[PDB]
DNA sequence: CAGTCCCTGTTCGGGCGCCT
DNA sequence: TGGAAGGCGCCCGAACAGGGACTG
């Protein structure tokens, strides 16, 4: 018995119709059970083919969890509620969160089940549960309350949230709190014990308002960049200087100061690649001033909240992965490398998955948005396995690229 | 007043749009007999109704003989109503495979009598169904009827039928957790570990349950009699098979002929190992008329011959034993053709299948292997809900070299080497470092957008040089060409410097097969070398030899 | 620079198979 | 006769999309 906030799709737009993908038997069982108990609690209810709309559903285990979580892929719905959760009820972003020495992420998503949902909307939360070997047709449902992983949910429940939070915001005046979808990001400059404790207090404090919390610890001040670096050699072959000029030439669309003329000079003849070329005065100097420019910031890169984030990843081999988040080409808001993630030296798809989650997470902390990924993988390869490795409650947008490495720009 | 059997499902038209007005077919009186016959019998039961002209909608009508029967089936073409009817979400997500079925001690297969007709239509919707029944002469008008139930031929019938049916069977299934009911349309497969007696009790019980909802279950039902005919298969207590496949005999083949043939063989490939459709499909490319006649190549003739030999001997599949592992083994068939068998106990197949798809202009065996493993994983996950353990004709180091080196994320799930040839390999490997003592070729080529004339050539550290004139070419082609030349004219170890991104990217992915003949020749040469190092420099940077050969090839 | 062309990849719609 | 549907699969080609280089 609460007042349902009305919701409309973006102007001139229709609800999501997206095929359910095949599910493993364990994910089908976990879902059949989750949905059964979610029904007898009135949170969802069966429906029929009359309703034209569908969203894909599946299950995951959070990192270290062992308990199954239901996960809906609302990306297509969220794209069509964009008006609502950007323009009307949306949330401001705490530029200090990223500065805090520790940040914990909590799943507050269960809270959303409390509030009911505008009834004219539920037609759009439609999702089908598949059967193994198509024994049965799809068991269709729809949501009677605020769904997890819908972008309208954390917005609509925002007033309730702010109210439940205000006591602890008053009790701990300087601890920063951010809400991004099903997660609450919470951070402090307190030492580890103090911090963990205060989290526990926020937990109880959440409990007497009627919520559970099935915690991820980040450290945004540990987060570093991955600058472009030129090699160091005592002797240079023709090949070495060719590779070097190629690299510097590409680097020049970023740092415009970069000069190739004195280094180009060295290459003047038609020479064998393995032949050693000693470095001239002015090339040693050009190489120096280049090394120095690559130390700087890029001029005039700043974050524009009106624009989408874009993330690129390159597979560097030997466990290493490099990435860059940017809005306009060559103006990079950040660059990074990951190494020895899970699946290093064994499974690429798992490592890419881990990388996509880490990158997304940093973007949420830093700008409060998810990037759109350009993934170095084939569509089928990713769509076959990504769910197996997915530990997170949101799902960023992606597209697939083929971009061979004619130059090694981002990693020596 | 009529009566109400089971809960109805709300319907609508495409908003602000209205119904089906189109004239009836010039139907032959022969059908009209068989038509008005059961037509009239409908109304008695509440299936149809007579309607005042107040209903301004008209839709065509016909019927086709139920296959393998003397009886007739009624079909109403709604295409114009379909176009204007609200969109549904189909609940039928696929087809069940026999190979997915577990072994059941006792098994029944029962069809519902007049299924779509046992399901209440929507009150408010019924009107739109208006159609008219023909006569022996054109004098008698014939009555106009509005369906009270689900017509055969609407676009909403199947989803509603399957949905309601599930809702009905729901309660029975909860009471009997140990019964398996595969529900496909109105076809029910019930199986259990019950004793044939207790089981038949249960079958009867079910028939009663379906009765409460208005669902008849005639003696059309398979009772004691393996094999059961189910979904185009014969089901036996320990084995299954496809119902026999007839392959057309035609002396002269049309396009439609080859289509039937191919699709028949694709149906067959779920069980008969080693079916190949490649060459028969080559015959269908870029052809106009389904009717048009085409001759069989000495290629497609061989294929069809050996495929016929495969079909000759009877084969059968087994069922699924959840306790044991799943195993998928793959064989390379040549020309991008792959076959596989999924089994549990060696030599006893659950099912078979093939991957023939050519994906990409340039590709290799390793990539196509990855592609098939994925096709098969997805298939498995649908049927058994789990991924098979894989047996692959690719050495463990081959795979390791490919995946670690490739710039793209790539993976295969748990798998082991099976030494069945022909083995999948990488046919050449690019050096990671320039080759000492090998001649260095700087290559370029250019071409004129208007002339389509161009040059491809090279210069080397040793003084060697060449330029070749080319006709009806493109910039891309000339860059590839320059590389081809450098390869032809060079020793067994060679350094090649190109400024072509396009060329370099094609070759760096180690293709063994190409749509392009020029790339095939490049491939052929790469395989012959002992060491190739390919390097890239940017154009127009005044680099080294790249500048010199850029000169040579504009001139 | 915008405006082409080349090329290569995806998506879609149409034919056959098979079930109901 | 010639004609309906929904679902899954294959194979094809024709359409659209989008990156990179060269040119007005
Ligand atoms: C074969 C076939 C079936 N259907 C649907 C419609 C039918 N429902 N009804 N009425 C179902 C079932 O068809 P079916 O099971 O083959 O026969 P049915 O009509 O139910 O009566 P029965 O012979 O006495 O058993 O499939 C179809 O729409 N077009 C077809 O060509
Ligand atoms: Mg029937």
Going from the N-terminus, what domains does chain A have, and what CATH number goes with each? 6-95+121-161 (3.10.10.10), 96-120+162-217 (3.30.70.270), 218-303 (3.30.70.270), 304-412 (3.30.70.270)
Q: What is the three-state SS of B289-307?
A: CCCCECCCCHHHHHHHHHH
Alpha carbons A241 and A229: distance in angstroms, whole number: 15
Neighbours of B504 (CB within 10 A): 21
Neighbours of B344 (CB within 10 A): 18
Q: Give backbone dihedrals phi and psi of B478, rounded to 5 degrees, phi first.
A: -75, -30
- Between the CA of residue B223 and those of B98, B206, B218, what are the distances in Å? 18, 14, 11
Q: Is the dihedral of CA B479, B483, B488, B490 positive or negative?
A: positive
- Find and give the residue nearest to D12, measured CA to C1': B285
Q: Where are the beta strands (DSSP E) in B82-205?
A: 106-111, 131-132, 144-145, 180-184, 187-192
Q: Which two tokens stand for residue B351?
A: 């099912």
Between chain A and chain B, how many beta carbons pairs sit less than 8 Å apart?
Answer: 205
- Find and give the residue nearest to C20, measured CA to C1': B185
The reply to whether B516 and B395 lie within a common domain is no
* Distance from the alpha carbon of residue B417 to the mean position of ligand 2, in angstroms: 48
The reply to whether B13 and B143 lie within a common domain is yes
The reply to whether B68 and B19 lie within a common domain is yes
- Between the CA of residue B248 and those of A376, B139, B299, B311, B354, what are the distances in Å? 47, 45, 18, 13, 22
B222 CB closer than 7 A to any strand C atom = no
Residues B544, A130: C-beta atoms closer than 8 Å: no
N-term to C-term CA, chain B: 93
Alpha carbons B99 and B350: distance in angstroms, whole number: 5
Q: Give backbone dihedrals phi and psi of A56, rounded to 5 degrees, phi first.
A: -75, 145
The answer to whether B491 contacts chain A (CB < 8 Å) is: no
The reply to whether B432 and B393 lie within a common domain is no
Q: Give backbone dihedrals phi and psi of A170, rounded to 5 degrees, phi first.
A: -85, -40
Closest CA to B386 of A403, A23, A13: A23
Q: Which long-range contacts (CB under 8 A, 24 or more apart) does B122-128 make?
A: B122/B8, B122/B9, B122/B10, B122/B11, B123/B8, B124/B11, B125/B11, B125/B12, B127/B19, B127/B55, B127/B57, B128/B13, B128/B19, B128/B20, B128/B57, B128/B81
CB contacts, 8 Å: A402 with chain B: 408
Please answer whether residues B349 and B342 qualify as being in contact, where contact means their C-beta atoms are separated by less than 8 angstroms. Answer: yes
Alpha carbons A321 and A160: distance in angstroms, whole number: 41
Choose the closest CB to B163 out of A137, A273, A385.
A137
Q: Is the dihedral of CA B111, B116, B118, B119 positive or negative?
A: positive
Q: Which residue has the tokens 């330029």?
A: B467
Looking from the CA of A309 toward its CB, the CA atoms found within 13 Å total: 25
B478 CB closer than 7 A to any strand D atom = no
Bases of strand D lying below 7 A from some protein CB: 1-14, 20-23
Please answer whether residues B85 and B47 qualify as being in contact, where contact means their C-beta atoms are separated by less than 8 angstroms. Answer: no
Contacts of A363 (CB under 8 A, 6+ apart): A309, A311, A325, A369, A370, A371
Choose the closest CB to A273 out of B97, B156, B440.
B440
Alpha carbons A55 and A18: distance in angstroms, whole number: 5
* Distance from the alpha carbon of residue B180 to the mean position of ligand 1, in angstroms: 22
Q: Which residue has the tokens 């020029």?
A: B518
CB contacts, 8 Å: B497 with chain A: 242, 273
Counting DSSP H helices and E strands in chain B, the numbers are 13, 22
* Distance from the alpha carbon of residue B145 to the mean position of ligand 2, in angstroms: 23
The strand pair at B493-498 and B439-447 is best described as: parallel
The reply to whether B438 and B539 lie within a common domain is yes
Neighbours of B155 (CB within 10 A): 16
- Between the CA of residue A53 and those of A18, A45, B90, B178, what are the distances in Å? 8, 15, 10, 33
Domain final residue pick, B403, B427, B451? B427
Please answer whether residues B236 and B320 qualify as being in contact, where contact means their C-beta atoms are separated by less than 8 angstroms. Answer: no
The reply to whether B111 and B143 lie within a common domain is no
Q: Give backbone dihedrals phi and psi of A308, rounded to 5 degrees, phi first.
A: -75, 145
Which CATH number goes with the domain that contains B446?
3.30.420.10
Q: Give backbone dihedrals phi and psi of B522, rounded to 5 degrees, phi first.
A: -60, -50
Question: What number of residues does chain A have?
Answer: 412
- Between the CA of residue A187 and those of A170, A196, A198, B420, what are the distances in Å? 15, 10, 10, 58
Closest CA to B247 of B263, B226, B228: B263
Q: Which two tokens stand for residue B12?
A: 């609508």
Looking from the CA of B274 toward its CB, the CA atoms found within 13 Å total: 12
Alpha carbons B520 and B355: distance in angstroms, whole number: 23
Q: Which two tokens stand for residue B307?
A: 């495929």
State which residues between 355 and 394 of chain B bring their CB within 7 Å of strand D.
356-358, 375
Question: What number of residues does chain B have?
Answer: 555
Q: Which two tokens stand for residue B28?
A: 């032959």
Alpha carbons B322 and B334: distance in angstroms, whole number: 34
Q: Which residue has the tokens 């239509």?
A: B121
Neighbours of B491 (CB within 10 A): 11
Give exposure, B170-185, as e/b (b: 16+ Cβ within 10 Å): eebbeebeebbbbbbe
The answer to whether B374 contacts chain A (CB < 8 Å) is: yes
Alpha carbons B486 and B503: distance in angstroms, whole number: 13
CA dihedral B468, B471, B477, B479 (to 10 degrees): 30
- Between the CA of residue A8 and those of A75, A339, B361, what are the distances in Å? 16, 44, 45
**DSSP secondary structure of B432-483:** SSPPTTSEEEEEEEEE-TTT-EEEEEEEETTS-EEEEEEES--HHHHHHHHH
Closest CA to B511 of B336, B356, B375: B336
Alpha carbons A348 and B403: distance in angstroms, whole number: 8
CB contacts, 8 Å: B90 with chain A: 49
Q: Which two tokens stand for residue B473?
A: 């070419």
The strand pair at B327-332 and B389-392 is best described as: parallel
Distance from CA of B94 to the nearest CA of A (A): 6
Residue A147 per-residue DSSP state: P
Please answer whether residues B80 and B155 qualify as being in contact, where contact means their C-beta atoms are separated by less than 8 angstroms. Answer: no
Alpha carbons A382 and A349: distance in angstroms, whole number: 7
Alpha carbons A158 and A16: distance in angstroms, whole number: 25
The reply to whether B102 and B218 lie within a common domain is yes
The reply to whether B146 and B40 lie within a common domain is yes
Q: Where are the beta strands (DSSP E) in A30-175?
A: 44-46, 57-60, 69-72, 102-107, 127-129, 139-143
Distance from CA of A312 to the nearest CA of B (A): 13
Alpha carbons B427 and B528: distance in angstroms, whole number: 9
The reply to whether B15 and B143 lie within a common domain is yes
Alpha carbons A189 and A101: distance in angstroms, whole number: 5
Distance from CA of A175 to the nearest CA of B (A): 40
- Between the CA of residue B103 and those of A242, B203, B457, what are the distances in Å? 67, 18, 68
| Bond into B161 cis (ω within 30) | no
| Three-class secondary structure of residue B74 per DSSP | strand
- Residue A107 is labelled as binding a ligand: yes
Q: Is the dihedral of CA A22, A398, B515, B392 positive or negative?
A: negative
Mutate to test the interface with B, among A24, A406, A408 (most CBs of B within 10 A): A406
Alpha carbons A325 and A356: distance in angstroms, whole number: 12
Please answer whether residues A167 and A80 qualify as being in contact, where contact means their C-beta atoms are separated by less than 8 angstroms. Answer: no
The reply to whether B8 and B151 lie within a common domain is yes
CB contacts, 8 Å: B374 with chain A: 380-381, 384
The reply to whether B334 and B393 lie within a common domain is yes
Alpha carbons A282 and A263: distance in angstroms, whole number: 8
Q: Which residue has the tokens 């759109």?
A: A372
- Residue A174 is labelled as binding a ligand: no
Interface of B with A in 517-536 (CB under 8 A): 533, 535-536
Neighbours of A369 (CB within 10 A): 17
The strand pair at A139-143 and A127-129 is best described as: antiparallel
- Between the CA of residue A239 and those of A258, A268, B99, B510, B540, what are the distances in Å? 20, 13, 58, 22, 17
Please answer whether residues A88 and A97 qualify as being in contact, where contact means their C-beta atoms are separated by less than 8 angstroms. Answer: no
Q: Which two tokens stand for residue B441?
A: 């070729």
Residue B99 parent element (H or E): none
Structure determined by: X-ray
Burial of A294 (0-12, 13-18, 19+ CB in 10 A): middle
B283 CA – C20 C1', rounded, Å: 32
Note the Cα B291 to chain centre separation in Å.
24
Please answer whether residues A324 and A356 qualify as being in contact, where contact means their C-beta atoms are separated by less than 8 angstroms. Answer: no
Q: Calculate ∠ Cα B471-B472-B474, nearest 5°.
A: 105
Burial of A42 (0-12, 13-18, 19+ CB in 10 A): exposed
| Three-class secondary structure of residue A41 per DSSP | coil
State which residues between 295 and 324 of chain A bring their CB within 7 Å of strand C.
none
Question: What is the CB < 6 Å shell around ligand 1?
Answer: B 111-117, 152, 185-186, 220
Question: Which residues in chain A are followed by a discontinuity, with C-to-N distance exceeding 2.5 angstroms?
Answer: 214
Q: Which atom of ligand 1 is nearest to the CA of B64?
A: 31
- Between the CA of residue B382 and those of A47, A60, A134, B91, B252, what are the distances in Å? 24, 18, 8, 15, 40
Alpha carbons B216 and B119: distance in angstroms, whole number: 12
Q: What is the three-state SS of B297-338?
A: CHHHHHHHHHHHHHHHCCCCECCECCCCCCEEEEEECCCCCE
- Secondary-structure percent of chain A, ordered helix, strand, coil, rounded to 5: 35, 20, 45
Residues B501, A406: C-beta atoms closer than 8 Å: yes
B64 CB closer than 7 A to any strand C atom = no
Point out which residues pair with A186 in neighbouring strands. Answer: A104, A177
The answer to whether B177 contacts chain A (CB < 8 Å) is: no
Point out which residues pair with A181 in neighbouring strands. Answer: none
Q: Is the dihedral of CA B416, B419, B420, B423 positive or negative?
A: positive
Q: Which two tokens stand for residue B333?
A: 């068939």
Mutate to test the pocket of ligand 1, among B68, B110, B185, B186 (most ligand atoms within 8 A of CB): B186
Burial of B118 (0-12, 13-18, 19+ CB in 10 A): buried
Q: Give backbone dihedrals phi and psi of B88, rounded to 5 degrees, phi first.
A: -105, 175
Domain final residue pick, B177, B197, B226? B226
Closest CA to B412 of A377, A347, A321, A344: A347
Closest CA to A123 of A16, A38, A41, A36: A16
| Three-class secondary structure of residue B174 per DSSP | helix
State which residues between 14 and 43 of chain B bring their CB within 7 Å of strand D.
25-28, 30-31
Q: Which residue has the tokens 């029975």?
A: B172
CB contacts, 8 Å: A283 with chain B: none
Closest CA to A405 of B401, B362, B508, B411: B508
Q: Which residue has the tokens 């049965």?
A: A136
Residues B374, A384: C-beta atoms closer than 8 Å: yes
Residue nearest to atom 30 of ligand 1 (CA): B152
Residue nearest to atom 5 of ligand 1 (CA): B152
Burial of A90 (0-12, 13-18, 19+ CB in 10 A): middle
Q: Which residue has the tokens 């030492």?
A: A191
Domain range spanning residue B412? 321-427
The reply to whether B440 and B325 lie within a common domain is no
Residue A316 parent element (H or E): strand A310-317
The strand pair at A139-143 and A310-317 is best described as: unpaired
Q: Which atom of ligand 1 is nearest to the CA of B111?
A: 25
Closest CA to B7 of B212, B205, B194, B172: B212
B57 CB closer than 7 A to any strand D atom = no
Q: Which atom of ligand 1 is nearest to the CA of B69?
A: 23
- Between the CA of residue A49 and those of A397, B88, B263, B462, what are the distances in Å? 28, 6, 31, 75
Please answer whether residues B306 and B286 qualify as being in contact, where contact means their C-beta atoms are separated by less than 8 angstroms. Answer: no
Looking from the CA of B275 toward its CB, the CA atoms found within 13 Å total: 23
Q: Which residue has the tokens 């769509």?
A: A383
Burial of B392 (0-12, 13-18, 19+ CB in 10 A): buried
| Three-class secondary structure of residue B95 per DSSP | coil
CA nearest to B173 within chain A: A136
Domain final residue pick, B427, B449, B472? B427
- Residue A348 is labelled as binding a ligand: no
Mutate to test the pocket of ligand 1, among B70, B73, B82, B163 (most ligand atoms within 8 A of CB): B73
Neighbours of A87 (CB within 10 A): 9
Please answer whether residues B146 and B129 qualify as being in contact, where contact means their C-beta atoms are separated by less than 8 angstroms. Answer: yes
Q: Which ligand is nearest to the CA of B219?
A: 1
Which CATH number goes with the domain that contains B326?
3.30.70.270
Point out which residues pair with B233 in neighbouring strands. Answer: B230, B242
A133 CB closer than 7 A to any strand D atom = no
Neighbours of A313 (CB within 10 A): 24
Please answer whether residues A341 and A318 qualify as being in contact, where contact means their C-beta atoms are separated by less than 8 angstroms. Answer: no
- Find and give the residue nearest to C17, measured CA to C1': B263
Closest CA to A82 of A9, A155, A147: A9
Alpha carbons B374 and B355: distance in angstroms, whole number: 10
In chain B, the number of structural domains is 5
Alpha carbons A231 and B157: distance in angstroms, whole number: 69
Alpha carbons A65 and B229: distance in angstroms, whole number: 46
Alpha carbons B444 and B543: distance in angstroms, whole number: 13
Rg (CA), chain A: 25
The strand pair at B180-184 and B187-192 is best described as: antiparallel
- Between the CA of residue A248 and those of A78, B110, B518, B538, what are the distances in Å? 41, 74, 33, 11
Contacts of B66 (CB under 8 A, 6+ apart): B72, B73
Q: Is the dihedral of CA A256, A257, A262, A266 positive or negative?
A: negative
State which residues between 310 and 369 of chain B bring their CB within 7 Å of strand C.
359-362
Residue nearest to atom 21 of ligand 1 (CA): B114
Alpha carbons B145 and B485: distance in angstroms, whole number: 78
Q: Which residue has the tokens 């449902």?
A: A141
B75: the nucleotide nearest its CA (via C1') is D4
């Amino acid at each position: 018995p609460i007042e349902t906030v009305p919701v409309k799709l973006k102007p001139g737009m229709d609800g999501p119709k997206v095929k359910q993908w095949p599910l493993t038997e364990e994910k089908i069982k976990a879902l059949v059970e989750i949905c059964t108990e979610m029904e007898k609690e009135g949170k969802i209810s069966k429906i029929g083919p009359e309703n034209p709309y569908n969203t894909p559903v599946f299950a995951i285990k959070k990192k270290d969890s062992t308990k199954w979580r239901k996960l809906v892929d609302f990306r297509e719905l969220n794209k069509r509620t964009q008006d609502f959760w950007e323009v009307q009820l949306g949330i401001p972003h705490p530029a200090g969160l990223k500065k805090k020495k520790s940040v914990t992420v909590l799943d507050v998503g269960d809270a959303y089940f409390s509030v009911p949902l505008d009834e004219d909307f539920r037609k759009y939360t439609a999702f089908t549960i598949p059967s193994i070997n198509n024994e049965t047709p799809g068991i269709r449902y729809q949501y009677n309350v605020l769904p997890q992983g819908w972008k309208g949910s954390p917005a609509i429940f925002q007033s309730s949230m702010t109210k439940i939070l205000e006591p602890f915001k008053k009790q701990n005046p300087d601890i920063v709190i951010y809400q991004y979808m099903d997660d609450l990001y919470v951070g402090s400059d307190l030492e580890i014990g103090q911090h963990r404790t205060k989290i526990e207090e926020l937990r109880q404090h959440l409990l007497r308002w009627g919520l559970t919390t099935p915690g991820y610890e980040l450290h945004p001040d540990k987060w570093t960049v991955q600058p472009i670096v030129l090699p160091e050699k005592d002797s240079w072959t023709v090949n070495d200087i060719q590779k070097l000029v190629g690299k510097l030439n590409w680097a020049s669309q970023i740092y415009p100061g970069i000069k190739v003329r004195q280094l180009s000079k060295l290459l003047r003849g038609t020479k064998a690649l393995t032949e050693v070329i000693p470095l001239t005065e002015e090339a040693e100097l050009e190489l120096a001033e280049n090394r120095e420019i690559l130390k700087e910031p890029v001029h005039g890169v700043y974050y524009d909240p009106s624009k989408d984030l874009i993330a690129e990843i390159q597979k560097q081999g030997q466990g290493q992965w490099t990435y860059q988040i940017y809005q306009e080409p060559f103006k990079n808001l950040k660059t990074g490398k990951y190494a020895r993630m899970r699946g290093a030296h064994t499974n690429d798809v798992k490592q890419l998955t881990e990388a996509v989650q880490k990158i997304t997470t940093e973007s949420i902390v830093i700008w409060g948005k998810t990037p759109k990924f350009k993934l170095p993988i084939q569509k089928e390869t990713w769509e076959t396995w990504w769910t197996e490795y997915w530990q997170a409650t949101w799902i960023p947008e992606w597209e697939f690229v083929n971009t061979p490495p004619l130059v090694k720009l981002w990693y020596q | 007043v009529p009566i109400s059997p089971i809960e109805t499902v709300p319907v609508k038209l495409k908003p602000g749009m209205d119904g089906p007005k189109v004239k009836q077919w010039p139907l032959t009186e022969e059908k009209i007999k068989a038509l008005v016959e059961i037509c009239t019998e409908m109304e008695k039961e509440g299936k149809i109704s007579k309607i005042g002209p107040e209903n301004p909608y008209n839709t065509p009508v016909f019927a086709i003989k139920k296959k393998d029967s003397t009886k007739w089936r009624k079909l109403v073409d709604f295409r114009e109503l379909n176009k204007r009817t609200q969109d549904f979400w189909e609940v039928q997500l696929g087809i069940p495979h026999p190979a997915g079925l577990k072994k059941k001690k006792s098994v029944t297969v029962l069809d519902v009598g007049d299924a779509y007709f046992s399901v209440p239509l929507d009150e408010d919707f019924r009107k739109y169904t208006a159609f008219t029944i023909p006569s022996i002469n054109n004098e008698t008008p014939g009555i106009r009827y509005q369906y009270n139930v689900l017509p055969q031929g609407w676009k909403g019938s199947p989803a509603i039928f399957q949905s309601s049916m599930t809702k009905i069977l729901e309660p029975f299934k909860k009471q009997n957790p140990d019964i398996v009911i595969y529900q496909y349309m109105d076809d029910l497969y019930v199986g259990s570990d019950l004793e044939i007696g207790q089981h038949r009790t249960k079958i009867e019980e079910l028939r009663q349950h379906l009765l409460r909802w208005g669902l008849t279950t005639p003696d059309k039902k398979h009772q004691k009699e393996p094999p059961f005919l189910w979904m185009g298969y014969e089901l036996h207590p320990d084995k299954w098979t496809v119902q026999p496949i007839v392959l057309p005999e035609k002396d002269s083949w049309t396009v439609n002929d080859i289509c039937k043939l191919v699709g028949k063989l694709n149906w067959a490939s779920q069980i008969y190992p080693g079916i190949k459709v490649r060459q028969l499909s080559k015959l269908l490319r870029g052809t106009k008329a389904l009717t048009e006649v085409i001759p069989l190549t000495e290629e497609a003739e061989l294929e069809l011959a050996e495929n016929r030999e495969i079909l000759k001997e009877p084969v059968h599949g087994v069922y699924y034993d959840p306790s044991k592992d799943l195993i998928a083994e793959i064989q390379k068939q040549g020309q991008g053709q792959w076959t596989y068998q999924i089994y549990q106990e060696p030599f006893k197949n659950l099912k078979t299948g093939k991957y023939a798809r050519m994906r990409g202009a340039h590709t290799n065996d390793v990539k196509q292997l990855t592609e098939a493993v994925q096709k098969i994983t997805t298939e498995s996950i649908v049927i058994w809900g789990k991924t098979p353990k894989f047996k692959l004709p690719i050495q463990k180091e081959t795979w390791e070299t490919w995946w670690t080196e490739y710039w793209q994320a790539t993976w295969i799930p748990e798998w082991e080497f099976v030494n069945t040839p022909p083995l999948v390999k990488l046919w050449y490997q690019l050096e990671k470092e320039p080759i000492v003592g090998a001649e260095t070729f700087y290559v370029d080529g250019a071409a004129n957008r208007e002339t389509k004339l161009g040059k491809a050539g090279y210069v080397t550290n040793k003084g060697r040089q060449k330029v070749v004139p080319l006709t009806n070419t493109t910039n891309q082609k000339t860059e590839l060409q320059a590389i081809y030349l450098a390869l032809q004219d060079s020793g067994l170890e060679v350094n090649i410097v190109t400024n072509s991104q396009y060329a370099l990217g094609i070759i760096q992915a180690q293709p063994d097969k190409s749509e392009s003949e020029l790339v095939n020749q490049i491939i052929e040469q790469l395989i012959k070398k002992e060491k190739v190092y390919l390097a890239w420099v940017p154009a127009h940077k005044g680099i080294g030899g790249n500048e010199q050969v850029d000169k040579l090839v504009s001139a």
